[PDB]
Amino acid sequence: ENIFLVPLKHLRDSQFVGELLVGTPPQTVYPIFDTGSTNVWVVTTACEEESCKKVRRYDPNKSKTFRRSFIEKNLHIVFGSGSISGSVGTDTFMLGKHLVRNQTFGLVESESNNNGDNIFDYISFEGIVGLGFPGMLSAGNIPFFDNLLKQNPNVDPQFSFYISGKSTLIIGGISKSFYEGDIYMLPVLKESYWEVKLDELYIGKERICCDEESYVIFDTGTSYNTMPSSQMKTFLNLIHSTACTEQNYKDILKSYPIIKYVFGELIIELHPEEYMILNDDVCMPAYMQIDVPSERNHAYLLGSLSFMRNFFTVFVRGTPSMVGVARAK
Numbered sequence: 162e163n164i165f166l167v168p169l170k171h172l173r174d175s176q177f178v179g180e181l182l183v184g185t186p187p188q189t190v191y192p193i194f195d196t197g198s199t200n201v202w203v204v205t206t207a208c209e210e211e212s213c214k215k216v217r218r219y220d221p222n223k224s225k226t227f228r229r230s231f232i233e234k235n236l237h238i239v240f241g242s243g244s245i246s247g248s249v250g251t252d253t254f255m256l257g258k259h260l261v262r263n264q265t266f267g268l269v270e271s272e273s274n275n276n277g278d279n280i281f282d283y284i285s286f287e288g289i290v291g292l293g294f295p296g297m298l299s300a301g302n303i304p305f306f307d308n309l310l311k312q313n314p315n316v317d318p319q320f321s322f323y324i325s326g327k328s329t330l331i332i333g334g335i336s337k338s339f340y341e342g343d344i345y346m347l348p349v350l351k352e353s354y355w356e357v358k359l360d361e362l363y364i365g366k367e368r369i370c371c372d373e374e375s376y377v378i379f380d381t382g383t384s385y386n387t388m389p390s391s392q393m394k395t396f397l398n399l400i401h402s403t404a405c406t407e408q409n410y411k412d413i414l415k416s417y418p419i420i421k422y423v424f425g426e427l428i429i430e431l432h433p434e435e436y437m438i439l440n441d442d443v444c445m446p447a448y449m450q451i452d453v454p455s456e457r458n459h460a461y462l463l464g465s466l467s468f469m470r471n472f473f474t475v476f477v478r479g480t481p482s483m484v485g486v487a488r489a490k
């Protein structure tokens with residue numbers, strides 16, 4: 162019981178959903194498990210958009226343990242992918258046979274693009290289980306993950322994502338099934354994200370960072386890696402897209418640069434086959450600009466598609482927090 166698995170299903174686009182049970186008796190939802198945010202969100206019967214009506218919507222009136230929050234707060238969140246709004250409440254959650262009572266969460270009432278048709282019209286969004294820190298907790302006293310640990314005192318305070326039908330969130334421990342070699346540890350900074358100091362960044366022989374304080378954030382909620390907007394053109398000039406097939410892409414990418422993230426004594430090298438994705442016979446880098454609240458201009462995300470596909474990540478919760486990285490098996 163004390164180390165347990167949450168199998169993740171890869172639905173398109175990317176991100177990866179697991180089974181969460183909410184309310185009494187339990188209603189099932191398939192949220193994404195997001196280290197890049199903190200709030201729990203659940204799509205509800207309050208959302209009357211077609212994008213909500215098409216999924217399994219949580220019905221708070223069917224939950225005996227649901228309590229609408231006393232403070233009637235409307236939360237608006239602008240993600241990089243779209244916007245969600247709704248109100249706040251409390252309920253009992255079940256994750257992987259573990260109970261988490263009196264958990265604050267957002268009840269989705271609305272979903273939109275940030276500008277007509279939006280991402281939610283394409284995907285099957287049912288919510289977010291944020292695994293970030295209290296600095297982006299919009300309502301309530303305690304983040305989900307800290308609450309689960311509080312109410313489950315024999316769980317070790319850690320979780321890890323193994324990406325790629327064999328993706329799984331492992332809570333309380335790790336498995337040698339998922340990684341090779343050693344795990345190196347970096348201290349977490351600030352109060353919002355699984356954020357670490359970045360000392361330098363090279364694209365092949367070119368140093369492109371760092372002269373100010375800079376940071377990497379480990380974000381399972383985003384497929385892509387990122388750079389700050391000022392370095393958008395930097396990256397696009399040094400790493401071109403190019404024609405490729407399934408048959409020749411290894412040869413085409415032999416000429417591409419190694420991207421080196423320098424975290425002090427630890428250097429993570431992303432080889433071309435680890436950061437270039439093949440879509441429509443084009444090799445394109447899995448990098449884009451994305452606004453990071455509270456870390457504009459100096460944050461670099463490491464996402465799921467490039468980074469976690471190749472590197473097993475362990476997230477150790479301070480009881481100071483640490484991130485562990487090792488090569489995926």
Ligand SMILES: CCCN1CCCCCc2cccc(c2)C[C@@H]([C@H](O)CNC(C)(C)c2cccc(OC)c2)NC(=O)c2cccc(c2)C1=O
Nearest residue numbers: 174175195197198239240241242297382383384385452453
């Ligand atoms: C292959 C492309 C997939 N894709 C675009 C669709 C994503 C659909 C699922 C979804 C919907 C809502 C939210 C999320 C996921 C999670 C967030 C994640 O929490 C972002 N974390 C950061 C730190 C960047 C952040 C930004 C803004 C607010 C914030 O609050 C603390 C945190 N993902 C995204 O904002 C996002 C952005 C661009 C592309 C994609 C996802 C993406 O990979």
